[PDB]
PDB file of C-alpha atoms in Angstrom:
ATOM      1  CA  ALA A   1    -207.783 147.337  12.496  1.00 47.49           C
ATOM      2  CA  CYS A   2    -209.973 145.552  15.119  1.00 47.07           C
ATOM      3  CA  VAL A   3    -209.237 142.728  17.970  1.00 48.18           C
ATOM      4  CA  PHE A   4    -210.908 139.484  17.562  1.00 50.97           C
ATOM      5  CA  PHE A   5    -210.901 137.209  20.576  1.00 53.25           C
ATOM      6  CA  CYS A   6    -210.958 133.515  19.017  1.00 54.58           C
ATOM      7  CA  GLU A   7    -209.986 129.976  20.938  1.00 51.75           C
ATOM      8  CA  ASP A   8    -206.602 128.500  19.483  1.00 52.58           C
ATOM      9  CA  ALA A   9    -208.520 125.669  24.000  1.00 53.18           C
ATOM     10  CA  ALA A  10    -207.026 129.183  25.132  1.00 53.34           C
ATOM     11  CA  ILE A  11    -208.449 132.456  23.834  1.00 55.06           C
ATOM     12  CA  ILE A  12    -206.268 134.538  21.727  1.00 52.68           C
ATOM     13  CA  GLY A  13    -206.373 138.191  20.658  1.00 52.69           C
ATOM     14  CA  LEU A  14    -206.236 138.488  16.811  1.00 51.83           C
ATOM     15  CA  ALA A  15    -205.823 141.822  15.048  1.00 55.08           C
ATOM     16  CA  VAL A  16    -207.260 142.238  11.941  1.00 56.34           C
TER      17      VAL A  16
ATOM     18  CA  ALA B   1    -216.758 124.898  10.451  1.00 56.23           C
ATOM     19  CA  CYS B   2    -213.810 126.368   8.201  1.00 56.59           C
ATOM     20  CA  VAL B   3    -210.215 126.714   8.745  1.00 55.69           C
ATOM     21  CA  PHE B   4    -208.739 130.590   8.352  1.00 53.53           C
ATOM     22  CA  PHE B   5    -205.362 131.452   8.060  1.00 51.37           C
ATOM     23  CA  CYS B   6    -204.323 134.811  10.016  1.00 46.60           C
ATOM     24  CA  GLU B   7    -201.028 136.095  11.226  1.00 48.24           C
ATOM     25  CA  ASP B   8    -200.619 135.889  14.981  1.00 46.97           C
ATOM     26  CA  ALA B   9    -195.656 137.307  12.447  1.00 49.19           C
ATOM     27  CA  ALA B  10    -196.568 133.617  11.920  1.00 48.47           C
ATOM     28  CA  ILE B  11    -199.746 132.447  10.260  1.00 50.02           C
ATOM     29  CA  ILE B  12    -201.832 130.130  12.193  1.00 49.34           C
ATOM     30  CA  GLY B  13    -204.966 128.023  11.367  1.00 52.20           C
ATOM     31  CA  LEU B  14    -207.995 129.318  12.684  1.00 49.61           C
ATOM     32  CA  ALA B  15    -210.970 127.293  12.908  1.00 50.00           C
ATOM     33  CA  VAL B  16    -214.245 128.776  13.180  1.00 54.86           C
TER      34      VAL B  16
ATOM     35  CA  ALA C   1    -215.591 134.441  -4.967  1.00 52.53           C
ATOM     36  CA  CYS C   2    -213.134 132.825  -2.692  1.00 52.67           C
ATOM     37  CA  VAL C   3    -212.150 129.343  -1.624  1.00 48.88           C
ATOM     38  CA  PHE C   4    -213.029 128.433   1.902  1.00 48.22           C
ATOM     39  CA  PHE C   5    -211.747 125.658   3.599  1.00 49.27           C
ATOM     40  CA  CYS C   6    -214.745 124.120   5.464  1.00 48.47           C
ATOM     41  CA  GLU C   7    -216.001 120.839   6.964  1.00 47.81           C
ATOM     42  CA  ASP C   8    -218.641 119.348   4.418  1.00 48.76           C
ATOM     43  CA  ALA C   9    -217.464 114.057   5.469  1.00 51.11           C
ATOM     44  CA  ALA C  10    -214.374 116.226   5.142  1.00 48.40           C
ATOM     45  CA  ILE C  11    -212.819 119.578   4.788  1.00 50.51           C
ATOM     46  CA  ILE C  12    -212.788 120.601   1.314  1.00 48.38           C
ATOM     47  CA  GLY C  13    -212.403 123.812  -0.899  1.00 44.06           C
ATOM     48  CA  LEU C  14    -215.821 125.639  -1.007  1.00 43.28           C
ATOM     49  CA  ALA C  15    -216.218 128.484  -3.031  1.00 44.82           C
ATOM     50  CA  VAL C  16    -217.551 131.165  -1.276  1.00 44.57           C
TER      51      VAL C  16
ATOM     52  CA  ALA D   1    -204.503 139.878   8.619  1.00 44.90           C
ATOM     53  CA  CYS D   2    -206.026 136.736   7.437  1.00 48.59           C
ATOM     54  CA  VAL D   3    -205.428 135.261   3.729  1.00 49.69           C
ATOM     55  CA  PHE D   4    -208.176 134.598   1.415  1.00 51.94           C
ATOM     56  CA  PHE D   5    -207.676 132.633  -1.931  1.00 52.00           C
ATOM     57  CA  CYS D   6    -210.027 134.672  -3.960  1.00 49.37           C
ATOM     58  CA  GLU D   7    -210.784 135.172  -7.642  1.00 50.45           C
ATOM     59  CA  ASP D   8    -208.977 138.565  -9.052  1.00 47.27           C
ATOM     60  CA  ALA D   9    -209.603 134.578 -13.563  1.00 44.60           C
ATOM     61  CA  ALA D  10    -206.511 133.814 -11.464  1.00 42.67           C
ATOM     62  CA  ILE D  11    -207.110 133.072  -7.810  1.00 41.85           C
ATOM     63  CA  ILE D  12    -204.831 135.441  -5.802  1.00 42.02           C
ATOM     64  CA  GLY D  13    -203.965 135.759  -2.099  1.00 44.18           C
ATOM     65  CA  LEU D  14    -205.707 138.216  -0.507  1.00 47.64           C
ATOM     66  CA  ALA D  15    -204.767 139.666   2.337  1.00 48.31           C
ATOM     67  CA  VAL D  16    -207.713 140.888   4.620  1.00 45.54           C
TER      68      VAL D  16
ATOM     69  CA  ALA E   1    -214.822 130.061  17.623  1.00 47.10           C
ATOM     70  CA  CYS E   2    -214.602 133.762  18.078  1.00 46.09           C
ATOM     71  CA  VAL E   3    -216.529 135.662  21.131  1.00 45.09           C
ATOM     72  CA  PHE E   4    -218.044 138.614  20.317  1.00 48.54           C
ATOM     73  CA  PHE E   5    -220.153 141.100  22.901  1.00 45.48           C
ATOM     74  CA  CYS E   6    -223.616 141.485  21.384  1.00 40.91           C
ATOM     75  CA  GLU E   7    -226.787 142.813  22.395  1.00 42.57           C
ATOM     76  CA  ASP E   8    -229.163 139.926  22.965  1.00 45.48           C
ATOM     77  CA  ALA E   9    -231.236 144.840  26.239  1.00 43.65           C
ATOM     78  CA  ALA E  10    -228.200 143.034  28.125  1.00 43.47           C
ATOM     79  CA  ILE E  11    -224.929 142.502  26.239  1.00 42.71           C
ATOM     80  CA  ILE E  12    -224.073 138.806  25.823  1.00 39.92           C
ATOM     81  CA  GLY E  13    -221.150 136.986  24.821  1.00 39.01           C
ATOM     82  CA  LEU E  14    -221.801 135.100  21.870  1.00 42.18           C
ATOM     83  CA  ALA E  15    -219.896 132.513  20.523  1.00 39.78           C
ATOM     84  CA  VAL E  16    -219.608 132.336  17.050  1.00 37.39           C
TER      85      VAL E  16
ATOM     86  CA  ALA F   1    -225.270 145.082  17.393  1.00 35.05           C
ATOM     87  CA  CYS F   2    -222.075 144.415  18.864  1.00 36.12           C
ATOM     88  CA  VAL F   3    -219.093 145.929  20.566  1.00 34.74           C
ATOM     89  CA  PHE F   4    -216.235 145.689  18.194  1.00 38.68           C
ATOM     90  CA  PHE F   5    -212.565 146.863  19.587  1.00 38.36           C
ATOM     91  CA  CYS F   6    -211.205 149.024  16.920  1.00 39.26           C
ATOM     92  CA  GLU F   7    -208.301 151.652  16.124  1.00 40.93           C
ATOM     93  CA  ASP F   8    -210.045 154.709  15.823  1.00 39.15           C
ATOM     94  CA  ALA F   9    -206.445 158.014  18.343  1.00 41.32           C
ATOM     95  CA  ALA F  10    -207.075 154.766  20.014  1.00 41.24           C
ATOM     96  CA  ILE F  11    -208.653 151.115  20.345  1.00 41.06           C
ATOM     97  CA  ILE F  12    -212.151 151.829  21.512  1.00 39.75           C
ATOM     98  CA  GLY F  13    -215.352 150.032  21.941  1.00 43.01           C
ATOM     99  CA  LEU F  14    -217.084 150.486  18.733  1.00 44.79           C
ATOM    100  CA  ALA F  15    -220.619 149.463  18.020  1.00 46.00           C
ATOM    101  CA  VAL F  16    -221.095 147.114  14.962  1.00 48.61           C
TER     102      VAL F  16
END
């Protein structure tokens, strides 16, 4: 899987 | 923008 | 295809 | 992973 | 939006 | 292209 950094604002790590 | 539902686990709305 | 929820106004199901 | 409502016809929750 | 490190050469933070 | 952080082991920068 890969880690995406998206704003939830605050940036969060998002694993996909 | 579009709303994606991803697990952060708990599902969260993610707007893109 | 899939249903994306995107602003189009209002957020609607959109066929992608 | 993120969930997408995609035709698989029936529309199925698909987990990418 | 999500941030991607993409070449634009210099690698730039790009906000999709 | 961009740098994705993906499991490949370890999570490394990956050119996408």
